[PDB]
Amino acid sequence: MLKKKQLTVLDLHPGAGKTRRVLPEIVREAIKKRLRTVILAPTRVVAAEMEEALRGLPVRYMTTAVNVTHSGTEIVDLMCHATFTSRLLQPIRVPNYNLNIMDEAHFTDPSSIAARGYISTRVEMGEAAAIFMTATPPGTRDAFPDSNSPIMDTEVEVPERAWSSGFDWVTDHSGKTVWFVPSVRNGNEIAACLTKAGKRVIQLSRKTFETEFQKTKNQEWDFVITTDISEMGANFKADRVIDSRRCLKPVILDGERVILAGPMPVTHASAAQRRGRIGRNPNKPGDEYMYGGGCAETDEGHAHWLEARMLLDNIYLQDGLIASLYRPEADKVAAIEGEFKLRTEQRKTFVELMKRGDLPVWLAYQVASAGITYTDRRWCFDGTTNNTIMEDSVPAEVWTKYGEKRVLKPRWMDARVCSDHAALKSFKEFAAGKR
């Protein structure tokens, strides 16, 4: 696999040992052949699990998730998918790695799609080798793959709201359950219902992932209520997965706004990864997987593929050449390579709105392409009245950096900035000029 001009997909079934058995062996061969290598982890939690599998090998951990003393003798670098894409965007010179390893290469976040595009382009050019590690490569139609031990698969109606009757099987369980919900607000309702019934619940989501995941190892729990973030390598000591088979889909309407569409069916890749959390112990057969819907190809027209094109159009590759998306996922968006290329100063603003502003890619691009500077927040209040952000069914208000109380009404409306309480509080802070 380590021969240049070669991209290998390592598609062993979930729990076959890609991370703990195959990855250390690849690292050893790369160090023997003096290949400057990058290892890309989807989350800080997977990076910490990788340090355990790679302990004793000279790897440089470019993450704050691991507390190791780097000697300077390392030719292998380990960083998160988002860190790699960020460093490509920023004016930091990233080495041109001879070997690129992506763990959980199925991740559909824009920074992961961009990383796959950049890497696969470098391989197509004959400049580098790559390895994509995932049980569910882009374009999988099988949601029931192999596992370490047999899983009991059951199609059943799954509640997506609080309940009093009709779902006795949910609370009649004596083990540990991982429940995938389409959104944070949906998770809150189900968690409140389980807690009222005397159950110990941990909730997980993108923003609180590292902190709450530690609670899954540190204390006894009955249920874990999570969003799709737990599809990226998160390991649990569970015996059942309850799967709504639903997700939210960010959609760009008329090229003017972003809505969160659905809940709608997940892809086969997500269903296989959610099911993949159980049946991982060969000595314990009979783990259950209860699913409450079918799969569909909801990644076509999904805003993340357009956002990944916005990122690759602003990453330098070679003169005016721009990286293409990784071929099996390239038709998920109708986009021309280069259409989102920004001039030097607008590009710098685009990077800063994402890095410091913490805004979604699409929204950061609308602001930067309009020729607005990072600290100028007048666009958060001058949008049409239909763009009024609402808090508790009344218009949201913020004190501007001028000491004037104004209704939050952005020129470009992106539902992700107000999808939950934490997202709205963070966007109010940005509109206030607090970061």
> Which residue ranges make up the annotated binding site?
12-19
Task: Give the CA count within 13 Å in the CB-facing half-sphere of 80.
Answer: 17
The distance of closest approach from Cβ of residue 424 to ligand ZV5 in the complex, given in angstroms and rounded to an integer, is: 22
Which of 196, 378 has the CB closer to ligand ZV5? 378
Phi then psi dihedrals of residue 250, to 5 deg: -70, 130
Q: Which is nearer to ligand ZV5, 31 or 407 (CB)?
A: 407
Task: Choose between 167 and 379: whose C-beta lies nearer to ligand ZV5.
Answer: 379
Closest distance to ligand ZV5 from the beta carbon of 374 (Å): 11
Q: Which is nearer to ligand ZV5, 211 or 344 (CB)?
A: 344
The residue among 435, 423, 429, 426 whose CA lies nearest residue 399 is: 429
Q: What is the smallest separation between the CB atom of 368 and ligand ZV5, expressed in angstroms? A: 10
| C-beta closer to ligand ZV5: residue 304 or 377 | 377
Rounded Cα gap, residues 61 and 26, in angstroms? 17
* Angstrom distance (rounded) from CA 209 to CA 429: 22
CA distances (Å), 216 to each of 43, 204, 221, 283, in order? Answer: 16, 10, 7, 22
Q: How far is CA 7 from CA 121, 132, 140, 256, in A?
A: 10, 8, 18, 37
The residues that touch ligand ZV5, with contacts defined as CB under 6 A, are 370-372, 376, 378-379
User: Which C-beta is closer to ligand ZV5: that of 163 or that of 379?
Assistant: 379
Contact predicate 413/252, CB 8 Å: no
Query: Binding site for ATP: what residues are annotated?
Result: 12-19
Q: How far is the CB of 124 from ligand ZV5 (least distance, A)?
A: 38
For ligand ZV5, which is the closer residue by CB, 32 or 378?
378
End-to-end CA distance of the chain: 45
CA angle (226 as vertex; 221, 230 as ends), nearest 5: 100
CB of 376 to ligand ZV5, least distance (A): 5
HEC profile of 320-336: CECCCCCHHHHHHCCCC
- Closest residue to ligand ZV5, based on beta-carbon distance: 371
**Which residues, in sequence order, are CB contacts of 137 under 8 Å at separation 6+?**
9, 11, 105, 106, 269, 328
**Helix %, strand %, coil % for the chain, to 5?**
35, 20, 45
Q: Shortest gap between Cβ of 366 and ligand ZV5 (angstroms)?
A: 11
Shortest reach from residue 61's CB to ligand ZV5, in Å: 41
